[PDB]
From Swiss-Prot, chain C:
Protein name: Splicing factor 3A subunit 1
Function, in words: Component of the 17S U2 SnRNP complex of the spliceosome, a large ribonucleoprotein complex that removes introns from transcribed pre-mRNAs. The 17S U2 SnRNP complex (1) directly participates in early spliceosome assembly and (2) mediates recognition of the intron branch site during pre-mRNA splicing by promoting the selection of the pre-mRNA branch-site adenosine, the nucleophile for the first step of splicing.
Domain notes: SURP motif 2 mediates direct binding to SF3A3.
Modified residue annotations for Phosphotyrosine: 48
Cross-link (Glycyl lysine isopeptide (Lys-Gly) (interchain with G-Cter in SUMO2)): 16
Entry's localization field: Nucleus; Nucleus speckle
UniProt subunit comment: Component of the 17S U2 SnRNP complex, a ribonucleoprotein complex that contains small nuclear RNA (snRNA) U2 and a number of specific proteins. Part of the SF3A subcomplex of the 17S U2 SnRNP complex which is composed of three subunits; SF3A3/SAP61, SF3A2/SAP62 and SF3A1/SAP114. SF3A associates with the splicing factor SF3B and a 12S RNA unit to form the mature 17S U2 small nuclear ribonucleoprotein complex (17S U2 snRNP). SF3A1 functions as a scaffold that interacts directly with both SF3A2 and SF3A3. Identified in the spliceosome 'E' complex, a precursor of the spliceosome 'A' complex.
UniProtKB/Swiss-Prot annotation, chain E:
InterPro entries linked to this entry: eL8/uL1-like (IPR050257), H/ACA_rnp_Nhp2-like (IPR002415), Ribosomal_eL30-like_sf (IPR029064), Ribosomal_eL8-like_CS (IPR004037), Ribosomal_eL8/eL30/eS12/Gad45 (IPR004038), Ribosomal_eL8/Nhp2 (IPR018492)
Name of the protein this chain belongs to: NHP2-like protein 1
Gene coding for it: SNU13
Outcome recorded upon mutating residue 34 to K: Abolishes U4 snRNA-binding
Tissue spec. comment: Ubiquitous.
Record function comment: Part of the small subunit (SSU) processome, first precursor of the small eukaryotic ribosomal subunit. During the assembly of the SSU processome in the nucleolus, many ribosome biogenesis factors, an RNA chaperone and ribosomal proteins associate with the nascent pre-rRNA and work in concert to generate RNA folding, modifications, rearrangements and cleavage as well as targeted degradation of pre-ribosomal RNA by the RNA exosome. Involved in pre-mRNA splicing as component of the spliceosome. Binds to the 5'-stem-loop of U4 snRNA and thereby contributes to spliceosome assembly.
An MF annotation (GO) of this entry: U4 snRNA binding
GO cellular component assignments: box C/D methylation guide snoRNP complex; dense fibrillar component; nucleolus; nucleoplasm; nucleus; precatalytic spliceosome; protein-containing complex; small-subunit processome
Organism annotation: Homo sapiens
SUPFAM superfamilies tied to this protein: L30e-like
Curated annotation (Swiss-Prot), chain F:
Modified residues (Phosphoserine): 93, 109, 146
Highest classification ranks of the organism: Eukaryota, Metazoa, Chordata, Craniata, Vertebrata
Name of the protein in its database record: U4/U6 small nuclear ribonucleoprotein Prp31
Whole-protein coverage range: 287 to 432 of 499
Lineage: superkingdom: Eukaryota
Connected disease: Retinitis pigmentosa 11: A retinal dystrophy belonging to the group of pigmentary retinopathies. Retinitis pigmentosa is characterized by retinal pigment deposits visible on fundus examination and primary loss of rod photoreceptor cells followed by secondary loss of cone photoreceptors. Patients typically have night vision blindness and loss of midperipheral visual field. As their condition progresses, they lose their far peripheral visual field and eventually central vision as well.
Subunit structure: Identified in the spliceosome B complex. Component of the U4/U6-U5 tri-snRNP complex composed of the U4, U6 and U5 snRNAs and at least PRPF3, PRPF4, PRPF6, PRPF8, PRPF31, SNRNP200, TXNL4A, SNRNP40, DDX23, CD2BP2, PPIH, SNU13, EFTUD2, SART1 and USP39. Interacts with a complex formed by SNU13 and U4 snRNA, but not with SNU13 or U4 snRNA alone. The complex formed by SNU13 and PRPF31 also binds U4atac snRNA, a characteristic component of specific, less abundant spliceosomal complexes. Interacts with PRPF6/U5 snRNP-associated 102 kDa protein.
Homology family: Belongs to the PRP31 family.
Swiss-Prot record, chain G:
Disease the record associates with this protein: Retinitis pigmentosa 13: A retinal dystrophy belonging to the group of pigmentary retinopathies. Retinitis pigmentosa is characterized by retinal pigment deposits visible on fundus examination and primary loss of rod photoreceptor cells followed by secondary loss of cone photoreceptors. Patients typically have night vision blindness and loss of midperipheral visual field. As their condition progresses, they lose their far peripheral visual field and eventually central vision as well.
Cystine bridges: none
TM segment ranges: none
Domain writeup: The MPN (JAB/Mov34) domain mediates interaction with TSSC4 and SNRNP200. Has structural similarity with deubiquitinating enzymes, but lacks the residues that would bind the catalytic metal ion.
Protein name from the UniProt record: Pre-mRNA-processing-splicing factor 8
Tissue and organ expression note: Widely expressed.
Gene designation: PRPF8
UniProt source species: Homo sapiens (Human)
Length: 404, 224, 81, 49, 124, 146, 195
RNA sequence: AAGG
RNA sequence: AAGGUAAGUAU
RNA sequence: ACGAUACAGAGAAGAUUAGCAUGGCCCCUGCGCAAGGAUGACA
RNA sequence: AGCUUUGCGCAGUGGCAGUAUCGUAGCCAAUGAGGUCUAUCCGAGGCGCGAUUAUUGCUAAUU
């Protein structure tokens, strides 16, 4: 009877929104509000009713003209190294291996009272730039850890600061020397004599993770979280290529020492090797699971290494256009992957495992674990001389390593 | 994206559900669809309920009271047992909660043990990996014992705890990480007297780098 | 931004979590109590006189009490002056 | 409601003790320290009333 | 979207896991609600990790918690909703910061460690 | 109301200080909003009490009222019921002029309690059901005080 | 309230207050003189006198708080020095805090509880407040050590107390204050007085 | 039912 | 002189 | 216009009474739901 | 394969207290309710209003 109808009414789900109740009542044609009918009585009535019922082309041409001779020269350098007796190459190989295994924590300096997100060696291997989350970038002398020229920095956390390739060697200190990226996307240029930014590159409305110059020193590569990476031309003072190829945010960008290629490693878990001369994705990295947080083109010119959250460091061969070896480096998220700047002497890896490891570039076997620190190793860099290793960390300190 | 409920919210829900059930039962009784509830009687309640009847027929009243109590107990047992997980259904729930979704990714851990001669330890590793769906391989050498274990993060954590505390020469975690896809099957415990064929077997699955790391770490430990 | 309802199983926008939960667990006992209260306060007869009646009574009192009001003072009960 | 700042709550259980002690101070003020000591006698053998 | 000032923001899966762990901690009498209690736990070093919402207006009223977490070496994470975080804590009122305390012998220790490892590898 | 005022103002000042330490809302918009909220709460605390209806006396009733029995009724009957110690104290002997036992209140007497003519050789025991006990809320307060 | 109506009501209250005070004082003079009076008029007069006396007491306490202590330092020094010299002359040993293992601790507690219960010796009906207080007394008697521990805790740490109710025994010559202390504090005060 |  | 009326229904 | 008569007359008191179940609180037991902890087992 | 922890239901048995249990399209509340003690410390509901045989039903009597 009607008791069963009342039982049915209880089981009927009716929206608790007054506007939705009024809309449902009007849809059925019944009066929206009776006299003295509040929202609760309206809901009860609804329940009962329901129960009843051209610069790009010029830049590309310049990059090609700059890169082709360098690629050729690298080719004859490799041919000459092949002509070198195998005994000499082997001997210098174990000399390098013995030198690496003797590395010790040379120094330990508090960069700032906040975690240090990046560290970069100057081209003359005498100055070190550290990027901090406090919004301050600092320049440190390499042989002795002491602050020499602080920077006012950004307002948010600073992602990465990279020296100009010709800085401290050829161009004047008052010119552009450094490019720093922040957590708000702002990119600011710096000079070795002015604490305030020389210039403020704009256009990145979203956070940019890494910023690095082209080896020619004329183009600056920025990677945003807009699934995009941008190339900024210093001479033109305007971004050139806002390439959109990553499915997710783009974290790291690595340039080719020849200058012909550029590699972008993003949160898409896949990497892409764009062609700076033609603007087409020549080779598409695949195999990494989870976001890739590191990438660096080897000075050899045909090897690429990438570090991701898989606790792995995959080495990619450009000649075969495929991965060659997967290095299971560290037991936590890998961030910094970098080869020896001069040649393929070794591979340096850093991760959130508060440790760094060294691997032979050809053999991909461990040599020395740079154990130390007490916080996650955010970034690392090797000096152009090759015997200097700097590893910033979450421990608010950066450390130097030289053979002893 | 579920929303949790405060203790006051839970109390309100339970109270209003019980009140609705009580009102429904009272309406059923009053309407005539349900007989009125007889008083609940126990042994201590026997006289207070039917003293007049207990005097004339003591054993009959005792039998009636015990029959009512046994009816209540039988109803309780029938409710409990009716809603009981079948023995096979208990396994199905257990066989599923331990089956993590490796579609997103597989977690791989590599272990190196100095000595693995004990057959009981071998059986422990094999059974624990099999129950936890931890597909992998065990390669036995003179000093290197590569234990590649792949599966779910919960199973990986349990198995890591297994050899770290439950099972005892020492056990060292070489590398714990993730990969896109699995590369080994069930436990096999391959015997590898020499390094070359062990590396070849690891290359068959495409995971020779685990063997390389284990061998290099063992060599470094030996030199140290 | 739809969150599953823990009491009905449906989905509501997050802007209406707290109000939906408060309304959803509203006892009908509240409705019957409010209806009873409405019935009681709209059926009791007024006990005191209305305002105009109070004013008229006070005017009569002032007319018949010249020891308190007025200019001239007659006896307690007389009204002439 | 008011708070008592001056005077005592004579309805307290121990208010009898406070009153007697304060009155003893009064007796010290009135009799002085010499006549009171003569009346109370030496502390070794106190005098009777 | 969400305030970029809350950079260590958890995704949906980690949000669900964090809310489940917060509810379990509340059931185990191992949780402290509110930014003031989170600050007190951080100052006394009895906090496993700090979960705070990203809808706090202004967000600067809880942006001091990451600094205290860095000083005391305690993981911290940002959740996308201050209403779901409050519900996880067992309180109908929104909560913009909750602290999971340290209790020796607690059965939640393994889950707490797993959540700490997940959070500490997600900030960057 | 100054304790609640101090607590609320301290909470809002902590919020403002946390905002200020990051150099945000330099205009003072957060400060103005917090001050407005504080003033609104203070006004609410100072708000005059609402009109409250007078409850009339219940009309006298003579109709029969049915009251349930059971364990609760049994316990209330045991408590309020007449006790042998009180039944015997209500009985006063006829012509047995007793002696005054209480200076501070005359007429007070134990009646048949411990007196000749009571008819009981042994003294009546104290009924434990009439023992003094404290309230549940009072017991909670005492537990909290511990 | 508009200012003219507010001033009208203020004048009304002033006139009514004058009449009220005069009526209370005249009635009390009649009571003292022995004039034949009823119980209702005496109850109303007692209420009015309680209100007037308590207003005077509020004024007195406010004056004491505003004008500070009325005893100057010199008078206080003289009084304290006299008391100290008297106590030293008598070789008085100060009364110590009641020890936890005090021998006579239970006897004093029993005496205090019996003194508290003396107000109900001839009672026939019990108020709810009386019921609660007498239950407290019974609980303290049942567990003397817990009551003694609570008493020591109150004596050592308790410095803030709840409000006390005041009433006046209407002796026709003069009003006698009667103070109502909380039963929890009453047990501590009674034990302290006995000790 | 009867009385002024 | 009072504070000392039973309230009724019938005839 | 009372009063006389015939009748009633306890002319001053919801005097109610038991049983059970709900409800509160606190365990214990069984079953279900969702999570988890610790440990044992050779070829 | 057992064992066991927490929370939520559903029942069973047992104990305790009826000066208390509820209701909140009323208000305030972890962006801090409320603080006699321990206050650079405590951390959760409070208040107002309403219902009542200090939770509410039937059953049996007298009526």
């Amino acid at each position: 009877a009607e008791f069963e109808r009342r039982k049915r009414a209880r089981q009927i789900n009716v929206s608790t929104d007054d506007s939705e109740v009024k809309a449902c009542l009007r849809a059925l044609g019944e009066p929206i509000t009776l006299f003295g009918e509040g929202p609760a009585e309206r809901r009860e009535r609804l329940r009962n009713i329901l129960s009843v019922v051209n610069s790009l082309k010029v830049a590309r041409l310049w990059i090609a003209n700059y890169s082709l001779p360098r690629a050729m020269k690298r080719l004859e350098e490799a041919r000459l190294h092949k002509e070198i007796p195998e005994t000499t190459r082997t001997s210098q190989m174990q000399e390098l291996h013995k030198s690496l295994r003797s590395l010790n924590n040379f120094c330990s300096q508090i960069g700032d009272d906040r975690p240090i997100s990046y560290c970069h060696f100057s081209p003359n291997s005498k100055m070190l730039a550290t990027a901090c989350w406090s919004g301050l970038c600092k320049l440190w002398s390499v042989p002795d850890c002491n602050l020499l020229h602080t920077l006012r920095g950004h307002n948010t956390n600073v992602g990465a600061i990279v020296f100009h390739p010709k800085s401290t060697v050829s161009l004047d200190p008052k010119d552009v020397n450094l490019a720093s990226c922040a957590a708000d996307g702002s990119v600011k240029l710096w000079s070795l004599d002015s604490d305030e930014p020389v210039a403020d590159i704009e256009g990145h409305t979203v956070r940019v993770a890494r910023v690095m110059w082209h080896p020619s020193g004329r183009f600056l590569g920025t990677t945003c979280y807009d699934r995009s990476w941008r190339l900024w031309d210093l001479e033109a003072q305007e971004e050139i290529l806002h390439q959109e190829g990553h499915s997710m945010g783009v974290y790291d960008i690595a340039f080719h020492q020849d200058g012909s290629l550029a590699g972008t490693g993003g949160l898409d878990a896949f990497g892409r090797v764009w062609d700076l001369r033609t603007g087409r994705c020549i080779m598409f990295l695949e195999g990494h699971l989870k976001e890739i947080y590191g990438i660096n083109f080897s000075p050899n010119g045909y090897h690429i290494a990438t570090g991701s959250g898989d606790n792995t460091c995959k080495v990619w061969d450009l000649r075969q256009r495929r991965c060659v070896y997967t290095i299971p480096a560290h037991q936590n998220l890998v961030t910094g992957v970098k080869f020896e700047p001069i040649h393929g002497n070794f591979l340096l890896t850093g991760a959130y495992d508060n440790t760094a490891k060294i691997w032979t570039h050809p053999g991909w076997s461990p040599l020395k674990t740079l154990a130390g620190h007490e916080g996650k190793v955010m970034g690392l860099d090797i000096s152009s001389d090759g015997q200097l290793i700097a590893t910033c960390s979450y421990d608010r300190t950066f450390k130097l390593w030289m053979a002893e | 994206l579920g929303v949790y409920l405060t203790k006051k919210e839970q109390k309100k829900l339970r109270r209003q559900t019980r009140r609705e059930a009580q009102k429904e039962l009272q309406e059923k009784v009053r309407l005539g669809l349900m007989p009125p509830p007889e008083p609940k009687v126990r042994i201590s309640n026997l006289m207070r309920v039917l003293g007049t009847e207990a005097v004339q027929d003591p054993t009959k009243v005792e039998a009636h009271v015990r029959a009512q109590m046994a009816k209540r107990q039988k109803a309780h047992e029938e409710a409990n047992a009716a809603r009981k997980l079948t023995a096979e259904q208990r396994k199905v729930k257990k066989i599923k909660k331990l089956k993590e979704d490796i579609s997103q990714g597989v977690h791989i851990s590599v272990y190196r043990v100095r000595n693995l001669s004990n057959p009981a330890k071998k059986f422990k590793i094999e059974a624990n990996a099999g129950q936890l769906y931890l597909t992998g391989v065990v390669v036995l050498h003179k000093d290197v014992n590569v234990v590649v274990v792949e599966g779910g993060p919960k199973a990986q954590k349990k198995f890591k705890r297994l050899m770290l505390h439950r099972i005892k020469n020492k056990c060292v975690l070489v590398w714990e990480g993730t990969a896109k896809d699995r590369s080994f099957g069930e436990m096999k415990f391959k015997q590898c007297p020499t390094e070359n064929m062990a590396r070849e077997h690891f290359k068959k699955h495409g995971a020779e780098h685990y063997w390389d790391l284990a061998l290099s770490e063992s060599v470094l430990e030996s030199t140290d | 931004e739809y969150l599953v309802s823990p009491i009905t199983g449906e989905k509501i926008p997050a802007s209406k979590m707290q109000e939906h939960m408060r309304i959803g667990l509203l006892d009908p006992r509240w409705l019957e109590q409010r209806d009873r209260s409405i019935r009681e306060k709209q059926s009791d007869d007024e006990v005191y006189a209305p305002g105009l009646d109070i004013e008229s009574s006070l005017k009569q009192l002032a007319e018949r009490r010249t020891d308190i009001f007025g200019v001239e003072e007659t006896a307690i009960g007389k009204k002439i002056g | 409601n008011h708070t008592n700042s001056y005077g005592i709550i004579r309805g307290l259980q121990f208010a009898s003790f406070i009153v007697q002690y304060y009155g003893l101070v009064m007796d010290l003020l009135v009799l002085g320290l010499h006549r009171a000591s003569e009346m109370a006698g030496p502390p070794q053998m106190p005098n009777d009333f | 979207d969400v305030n970029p000032k809350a950079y260590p923001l958890a995704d949906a899966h980690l949000t669900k896991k964090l809310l489940d762990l917060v509810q379990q901690s509340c059931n185990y009498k191992q949780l402290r609600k509110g930014a003031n209690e989170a600050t007190k736990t951080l100052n006394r070093g009895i906090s496993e990790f700090i979960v705070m919402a990203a809808d706090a207006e202004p967000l600067e009223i809880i942006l001091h918690l990451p600094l205290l977490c860095e000083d005391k070496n305690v993981p911290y994470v940002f959740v996308r909703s201050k209403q779901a975080l409050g519900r996880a804590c067992g309180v109908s009122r929104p909560v913009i910061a909750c602290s999971v305390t340290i209790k020796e012998g607690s059965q939640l220790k393994q889950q707490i460690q797993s959540i700490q490892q997940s959070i500490e590898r997600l900030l960057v | 109301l100054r304790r609640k005022a101090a607590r609320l103002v301290a909470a809002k000042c902590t919020l403002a200080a946390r905002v200020d330490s990051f150099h945000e809302s330099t205009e003072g918009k957060v400060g103005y909003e917090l001050k407005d909220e504080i003033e609104r709460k203070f006004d609410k605390w100072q708000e005059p009490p609402p009109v409250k209806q007078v409850k009339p006396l219940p009309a006298p009733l003579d109709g029969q009222r049915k009251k349930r029995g059971g364990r609760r009724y049994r316990k209330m009957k045991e408590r309020l019921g007449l006790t042998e110690i009180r039944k015997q104290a209500n009985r006063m002997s006829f012509g047995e002029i007793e002696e005054d036992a209480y200076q501070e209140d005359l007429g007070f007497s134990l009646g048949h309690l411990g007196k000749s003519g009571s008819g009981r050789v042994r003294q009546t025991q104290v009924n434990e059901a009439t023992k003094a006990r404290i309230s549940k809320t009072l017991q909670r307060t005492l537990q909290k005080q511990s | 309230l508009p200012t003219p109506i507010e001033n009208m009501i203020l004048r009304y209250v002033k006139a009514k207050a004058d009449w009220w005070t005069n009526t209370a004082h005249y009635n009390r003079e009649r009571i003292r003189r022995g004039a034949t009076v009823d119980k209702t008029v005496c109850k109303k007069n007692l209420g009015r006198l309680t209100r007037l006396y308590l207003k005077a007491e509020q004024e007195r306490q406010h004056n004491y708080l505003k004008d500070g202590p009325y005893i100057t330092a010199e008078e206080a020094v003289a009084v304290y020095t006299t008391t100290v010299h008297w106590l030293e002359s008598r070789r008085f040993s100060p009364i110590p805090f009641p020890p936890l293992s005090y021998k006579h601790d239970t006897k004093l507690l029993i005496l205090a509880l019996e003194r508290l219960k003396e107000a109900y010796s001839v009672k026939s009906r019990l108020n709810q407040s009386q019921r609660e207080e007498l239950g407290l007394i019974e609980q303290a008697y049942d567990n003397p050590h817990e009551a003694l521990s609570r008493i020591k805790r109150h004596l050592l740490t308790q410095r803030a107390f709840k409000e006390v109710g005041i009433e006046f025994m209407d002796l026709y010559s003069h009003l006698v204050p009667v103070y109502d202390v909380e039963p929890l504090e009453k047990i501590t005060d009674a034990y302290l007085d006995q000790y």
